């Protein structure tokens, strides 16, 4: 999201799997899409 330089989205404990599901949930193009974007992680963390 924004377009952060760095923004980074690391937990001790596993998001990995729950980021692709967010997305997913979201609708973003992650699955259909290889690896997943660090701006979608971002996103991710981003979003509240």
Given at each position: ?48
């Amino acid at each position: 999201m924004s377009g952060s330089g760095r923004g980074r989205g690391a937990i001790d404990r596993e998001q990995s799997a729950a980021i692709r599901e967010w997305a997913r949930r979201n609708g973003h193009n992650v699955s259909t899409r290889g690896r997943i974007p660090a701006d979608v992680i971002d996103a991710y963390h981003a979003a509240d």
